[model samples]
Target: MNKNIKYSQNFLTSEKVLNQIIKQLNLKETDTVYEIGTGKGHLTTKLAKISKQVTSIELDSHLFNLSSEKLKLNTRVTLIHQDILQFQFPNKQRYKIVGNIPYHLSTQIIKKVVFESRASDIYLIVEEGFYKRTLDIHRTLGLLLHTQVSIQQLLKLPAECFHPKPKVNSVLIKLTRHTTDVPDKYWKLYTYFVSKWVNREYRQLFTKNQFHQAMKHAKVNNLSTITYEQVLSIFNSYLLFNGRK
Candidate 1:
């Protein structure tokens, strides 16, 4: 954990917060939890006590081995050595995700869990700023993710809560699939539609003028009882207003 620069490992050292994380999970005996960054097995050990099974992944070889040894007696736990992005979620199984994840991989991890694979619920400790971005509908990521899932803040974890404390505030937030009515294809279409607003390739973000203009001029707002179709309708309206439709 000392190689903080390389690993970005800020192990949660607060027992108080750990209990809170468990409480918010509301795990049942039949539940399976897919945990990321099994640092020292502290959270994993606790999660095992409540859930039916736990599958935890670690990127660092040393930490992988360390937790593997520490968690050797956990019969219901499966430890894997793989990058989180490369970790393929099992098909035909129901699982919840819980992790005190790396701050840097927050976006990619959330995207994969929600879109690439389906999880009933996600509990992650991310930096407060990124947390805000998810809840802030004005931002592109926030707007897009909001169209799919319901996000809630479970706990506010300050810097002092971790081992090699992070410089920024961290929070534990829960994400769950709230709207199953939005078909799977539309998420991709929605993202690709959002694609048109960005300036150039590879920067999966909205360009200021077009993005703000759409929101500034579009009739339907995000924070409404607007249907998924209505949200896309706003995009169509954006084009019509700009003569780009």
Candidate 2:
């Protein structure tokens, strides 16, 4: 394991687990798979066997060097040594993301996978707790009010499945992008609004004056009656009326 990569869990993707994921995703050979934090290239090697092209990222130089050497013979693989957060996707090229992500940065990475980089789909083998935090009855209602990704699948893996076993078991969640039409200029506001809207709904809560202030700045008087038109109108006004640093 490379010490340079900030991973809480060890590089582990059992053959059984790998087969399950491959069978579930039913990925095509023409598909482009982007494996995030592809330490030691285990998953990357597996994916390269199926995908037409596999772009795997390993931030640790030592691990990157070692893995690339092993995978260099696989002509379909492109191994990059870079932080996942800082790496940018090539313009207009769509990809499907697959990873046993760094649990500490799961949400951050998920947001970028779903919204920022705008991938076609994302398949995550993650900490089980995230599912409950994001998908419970009371929690999910509020969450879906803004975004629509669901806990479609959850598998309980045995400890023997992982090389350096994690304290908590892993679960797989599939998230596919529903739209690619988001304007670059409005992306931040769009995500902020969506997150807040869902949070507000789930908690049955509101920061009365703060919400009002945000609404007012966007010239929205009736929050209940707010439409996309109203939202965009307010968004534009907020951008123009106040210089957001």
Candidate 3:
């Protein structure tokens, strides 16, 4: 734990912010938490006290071993040394996810925790800029709560919070699934449809054009509802990343 180990390429959430995220999650004794990048068990130590169980994945082997040593003494914790992407969902169980996510893997990890597990709750930290662009009011904050209860502070932490300050500032975000029937199968369709507007390989996939396309898809004027079938139809017509679908 004394040696330098970078759990994320960018900033980490300050303890103050992490605590607030935990509070906002309203964790229960019956809940199981799956945390990503549990570097050195800093946050895990805190969560274990509240949740029924904690499962964490760490990408850095040294940090993983270190955190494991600290958490192994506890009967309620399971820490895996592996990329969150490669780690399989726990069998025959449901768990909430929490993480001070790397700026690099924010979106991918969120989808994994949400789509992969159909998680009931997710507490995370993400890039501030992304927090704005993607989760902006939706022209209606209520809609976001309907999809997932998310609260993000665009200015909670600075780059200086990281061991090696990142190139950009980041924020703390908490997301809780308010419902289970999200028609998740449509995520495949949504992913495919969004691709038609923004190619994944592009440096800035959500450029102005892409934004316009997204707004169009959502019928920006009508924030109350979006048709699953409409998005699915567009994805079916897309060219890339569709073969696997």
Query: Top model by TM-score, which number?
Result: 1
Residue-level lDDT tens digits of model 3 in 110-226: 554454454565666655565554453332222223234444442355655554555666566556544432245544444434443333322243434654475566565342233
TM-scores of all models?
0.61, 0.54, 0.52
User: What lDDT score is found at residue 19 in candidate 2?
Assistant: 56
Per-residue lDDT of model 2, residues 127-201, tens digit only: 646554554323332233224343355455654566565566767767555454235555555546544554464
**Deviation (Å) of 66 in candidate 2:** 12
User: Candidate 1, which ten residues in sequence have the lowest lDDT sum?
Assistant: 197-206
Check candidate 2 and list the clashing pairs: 218-234
Q: Looking at model 3, report the run of 10 residues with the lowest lDDT sum.
A: 137-146
Sort order, lDDT high to low? 1, 2, 3
**Each model's C-alpha lDDT?**
0.58, 0.53, 0.50
Compute the lDDT of residue 197 as modeled in candidate 3: 31
For model 3, the stretches where C-alpha displacement exceeds 4 angstroms are 1-14, 38-41, 59-75, 83-88, 91-94, 136-169, 178-245
Query: How high a TM-score does candidate 3 get?
Result: 0.52
**Candidate 2: residue 34 lDDT (0-100):** 67
